Amino acid sequence: QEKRKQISVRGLAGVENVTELKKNFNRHLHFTLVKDRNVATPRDYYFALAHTVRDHLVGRWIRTQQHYYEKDPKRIYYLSLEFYMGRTLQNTMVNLALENACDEATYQLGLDMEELEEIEEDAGLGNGGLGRLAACFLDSMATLGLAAYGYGIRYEFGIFNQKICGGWQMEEADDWLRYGNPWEKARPEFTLPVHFYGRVEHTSQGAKWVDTQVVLAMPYDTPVPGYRNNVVNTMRLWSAKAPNDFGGYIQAVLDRNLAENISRVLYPNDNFFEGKELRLKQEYFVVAATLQDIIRRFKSSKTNFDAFPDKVAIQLNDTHPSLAIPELMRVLVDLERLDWDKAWEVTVKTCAYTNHTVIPEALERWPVHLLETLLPRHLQIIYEINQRFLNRVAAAFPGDVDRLRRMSLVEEGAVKRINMAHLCIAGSHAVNGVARIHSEILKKTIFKDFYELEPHKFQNKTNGITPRRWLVLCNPGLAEIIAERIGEEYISDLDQLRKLLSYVDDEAFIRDVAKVKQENKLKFAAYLEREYKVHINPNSLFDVQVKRIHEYKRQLLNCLHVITLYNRIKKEPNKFVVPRTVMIGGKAAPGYHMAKMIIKLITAIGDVVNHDPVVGDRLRVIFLENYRVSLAEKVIPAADLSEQISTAGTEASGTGNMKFMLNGALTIGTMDGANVEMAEEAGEENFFIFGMRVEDVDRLDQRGYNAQEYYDRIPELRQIIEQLSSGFFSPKQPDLFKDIVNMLMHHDRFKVFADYEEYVKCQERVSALYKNPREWTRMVIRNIATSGKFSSDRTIAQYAREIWGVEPSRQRLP
Amino acid sequence: QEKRKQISVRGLAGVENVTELKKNFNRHLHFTLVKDRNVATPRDYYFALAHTVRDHLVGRWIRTQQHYYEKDPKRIYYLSLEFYMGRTLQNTMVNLALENACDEATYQLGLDMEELEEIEEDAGLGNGGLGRLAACFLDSMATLGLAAYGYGIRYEFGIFNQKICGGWQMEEADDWLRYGNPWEKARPEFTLPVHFYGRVEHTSQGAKWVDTQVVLAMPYDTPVPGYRNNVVNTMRLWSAKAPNDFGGYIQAVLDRNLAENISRVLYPNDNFFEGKELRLKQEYFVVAATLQDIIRRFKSSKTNFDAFPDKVAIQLNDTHPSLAIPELMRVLVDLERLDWDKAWEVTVKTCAYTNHTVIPEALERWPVHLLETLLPRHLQIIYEINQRFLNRVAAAFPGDVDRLRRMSLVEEGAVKRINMAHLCIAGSHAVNGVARIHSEILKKTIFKDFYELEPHKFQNKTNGITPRRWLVLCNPGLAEIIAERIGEEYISDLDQLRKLLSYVDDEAFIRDVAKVKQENKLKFAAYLEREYKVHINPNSLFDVQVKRIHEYKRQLLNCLHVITLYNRIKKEPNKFVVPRTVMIGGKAAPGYHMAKMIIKLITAIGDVVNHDPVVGDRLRVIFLENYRVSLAEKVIPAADLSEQISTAGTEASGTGNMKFMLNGALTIGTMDGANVEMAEEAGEENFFIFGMRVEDVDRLDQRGYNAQEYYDRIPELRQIIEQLSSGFFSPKQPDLFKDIVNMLMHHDRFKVFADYEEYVKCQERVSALYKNPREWTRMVIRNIATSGKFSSDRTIAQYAREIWGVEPSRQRLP
């Protein structure tokens, strides 16, 4: 519509700017897409605009990288197996201040820019929180003027496209490069060899890794624009390519596929270590090519590796790139011929490690035999690291043999394994958790032994989200009513949102907050109708739980509440209840039968609830298909209630929680992860906090969790388990949910029933507030106004000062 | 050098043209290659110029295709499994008249354009003659203003890169898309489904092909510029892509490779049918996607399929796309619901078939079981075609049962097979050979039965080469001395070269012809030094045999001559002989042990000859590595003597013969293929014709070829076989050549020894003429001057008028 073109936060439609954009658009359509308007599809128009927008950061990208070469700052390398980037077109336009100019130029050409934006494929190179965190981090590091590089893998297929067929998840290949990627620049001239297998021989000079198989790593560079500071940083993603030279000639050519399979697809396993050789190869591939780049940049600067930690930070996003530690030692000792002790000093001062979960099944514990076959030299180095590290433990804690056994990089058993978390702590000068409660649990329990050896190593860095994608882009309406009162500085200084507490009693701001939410809901309600012919009641409370499907996130607890609301309506059909649209979305890991069963249960509950004429428009429950970064940008601004209901102690931080808080949703949740700090910032009176705290969970584990006690004492819970058992939600297959029932009653590691009573009552309080629109909106104002801490600019500023030793700067390039 | 910039045939360096080219060059380097001159490699500079040159044909390409849509001419579809295109940059510049402007613009930027041209990968999507013929044909059809489309497969790997290691061929993957292809435009929006396997069911309506596996065919469009007529035609190459939807999720994603393997690599088997399922899939893939395109274009024009043959010609390059015939019948009968007899009338009037060899092992004879599994509906249609075709044979030739058995599409035996040549003749209104002697043998022997049923079907179309790539581009020096005398019209009217017979006695032209040859030889001699550190004597006769390595091409006969020259020098070291550099090059099919042994024999003869101090610079024999279109453009203009020495009756035409004739080489050859017509055009007195004619070969077959008789009667031959046997050319492995010796003495299908005596004497006459430079050059003038018939413009004009029913035109577009 025109209205959106009038949005001040979207910048200026300069006459000359608009004229040049139209000309460059038409130029790309003719010379780049080789089409005239006669035959051009919306896809052609999307690509013409994407090429036009990309041209506007080429000068800045070249100048930024030239500026780092000349000024030689310390370089930050963010190593991750995942970059959950989403779409690039709107983000680029926001960060370059081109959004209103492009909007006007496309409008004058007869085009709806927002329809074109829907054509762009997500770069879905992530599973969830960790991947999206890497993405928010690249944006904040560019905005803070850091000389920062994202390093990862250019997966041919990202996280699988989820279809729901017969109420079940079906997985399809996320063919995101089908139509090409206008953002990336292939750098095949900067291709590097990566080695696999082979053997270690010992020459006059020392160890030599020989007889290896080569896979080439071909880098692809994507631009990362800072917010209006003329800074354009690089995300470098490596693509696997079969080496130059070699069933027959034909089979040998087809067999190039096996090496190229290394970058073929993202492992969709979110919170579970599988131990697949191909995943190990992906981890070594990204670490090996990346560290060659890092060493090359270091040596072409203003040799003596003493200065390497003053010019390089390597940040390990989880244990996935943990092989950086032995790889850096391998390069320094075997190729640069440093003494072991000097090499180790350099390695520890270079590397830092971010831990993202305490869940034991997440821990990377590679079989020694697999390491011995694939990476023989890395295994030798790991054993040497282990010897020297345990010698330090023995000196600090003389005769504490149990501690030596617990701290060892080597795990004894039927299969001997390397603990990659232990390797990361040993080879890193800093270890951080991703929220205060998580970082304290790391020092208290999980890494207590490591904390006692080296307390100075252990840090907190509470996660954050970029206010650019998660407010200005996704919710320009809310960004606009904020700018109208406090100006635009908050977009890169989010603590300025605290100025909004001055408007808790301002009739105009109260009106405007509620109006923006209603607009967002009408647009999302429309979306469901247009793309899925799904009708939702737009005067309903939007109750949203979007995140990966896991027992620990307790989508099942949400299911028990939804069926509780259904059964209360049936018992007292005459009694008024606040109408709800309950939306659950997210992907289940291919495999995880239980996660796939929970998706079927959500759709099955919907099948009953949504067709009961007594319920009608008072309650609707819908499974949002293919939850991904692009769909998060649509549903989160439309949300009234944010479900953050993980068992206390299980969610290290969460970032979806922060997105909802920034976009004018109230939160129902446990005192878990960053929920604790969110409630602290806003005041607990402005959060719907319920359920067991970590210490209540621990007291239940101490005496044993008996789900039967809850079943016996709670009539409403008993009625629901009996509906699930007897086939009420699967009449044509009455035993369909027996595995869910049996897990809840006898094998529930996440104590669903133990929080049921507090959850249902807490949800009653939510409904009671929603019936009072003014006080609902006033409480929302108090949440948005205190969301500033959860800016990833704040997080990155802390990494820069406390771990990397660099000073951030919002000062602009010319 | 500057001199080449002064070449009038290379066009004008307009001041504004040069200024715009430099600006667009710098523009591409910044916005396309994202590099500033600081860091730019010669590769960046090549790509910047390629993008700049490509931009200059975008308007013409769009207008040409729009012009065909509006004027609705009959469309020519040239279906081939091979397009042996070579490099595109220089060809584009020649056809757009930009060569001197680009040369000047790059010069002003401090760049050598010819060094940049060496960076471009050949599009090596061909094996040899048939593939390069398809390439010359696209060029001539554009130059003749035909509404012509090349349709083929976008192989990820073309013909293998040949390395010589220890004197043996080694094959490497021809990774021609490593750095990208600036010429092609991906059209993923015009992606089409191709079906494989499945089964035939019979509904109310008729046959239905069901339960198939889908492979997507994604088209890539390359421009084909005519010579300065503003015409830009299309080569559409299909890429295999796994369908949208589906060992586990991960194995299912990796298994997309199996479908994508269909377009992975060119079968390097030049003159041998192998019967590989994957080759059958490539043949159906190109035919199926192509015929969907053809039908779509037909229906979006100014339904009734009665007009289809008035608006479509399908030219089948060999039997490789022979499935077009049953596929067109399948579409017309099963999907468009035409009566069988009407469908057949349409199919025969649409399709024509070009035969390229009489060698039995070349004939495509697919097992019926393979067809039944992969293409069940095509097999049914082929059986129906066969029934109706043999019914016509039975009516024409009542009671001739032997003729029914010989003409059948179905070949009886242990394995029953479909003869694809028989299918092509049945389903085509025209059948042609590729030289007069070949086309007459087709009517006399191979297809005699078919000629007798339908004599009107059988045509000759003598092959040709484009005078653009094979004279103006590769030999601008010779193009220039010709233009100086007769102007530039000959470049698209090559019969104008006959005007050069007026200069046989012209002292200045004689001087200039010899000077251009000497320049070409000095440049090729330099090339060997720069790229291979190989020294050649530049006052030596350049004796060149470049072509695929096959027993029928008799590289071995050349080897016996080279060793004859070596042994004569050793016997009479004091006797003067014309110094020679004997150059043999070409690829052996992976497999063909004998072809690989012949390459080793050439290098082994070189190892002795090139290190014998008695011989010194008087005789050098070198194996030219990686013979391909780009290397043909270098060596052929430097050649003095063209070896075309195939056994009479074995080479259908040849095109290398024509390239040498156009570039000022004299020819030693058999009365075989187009050699016959070349000698007829120039006068036999201007050719070194030797050896058995077809009827002498036939008389030897009638009484039996006994190689021993030649061995017993020829002392010099006996001495050579004994050197090969005893290990003179393999001292460290004395029996290394026993298989070559045993084949020559007992299993020689190509009668090498039978032409030995005439060959050696004919070579004596060559040397005798070379000792007289004036008369050598005068005879060259008489060859170049009469090469005009062998223009592919002449060939295409004949296809257009005699088979396609369209009138050619050199008249320009605005």
Ligand SMILES: Oc1cc(O)c2c(c1)O[C@H](c1cc(O)c(O)c(O)c1)[C@H](O)C2
């Ligand atoms: O930021 C948002 C928020 C939303 O709730 C929606 C958004 C974008 O775009 C969708 C959409 C789909 C299409 O298929 C279109 O063509 C189109 O223009 C917009 C739909 O309106 C819902």
Ligand SMILES: Oc1cc(O)c2c(c1)O[C@H](c1cc(O)c(O)c(O)c1)[C@H](O)C2
């Ligand atoms: O048409 C011809 C004819 C030839 O005989 C040669 C040609 C081109 O280019 C080669 C060459 C190789 C390189 O590596 C270069 O850099 C370069 O400029 C030229 C070499 O001179 C030999």
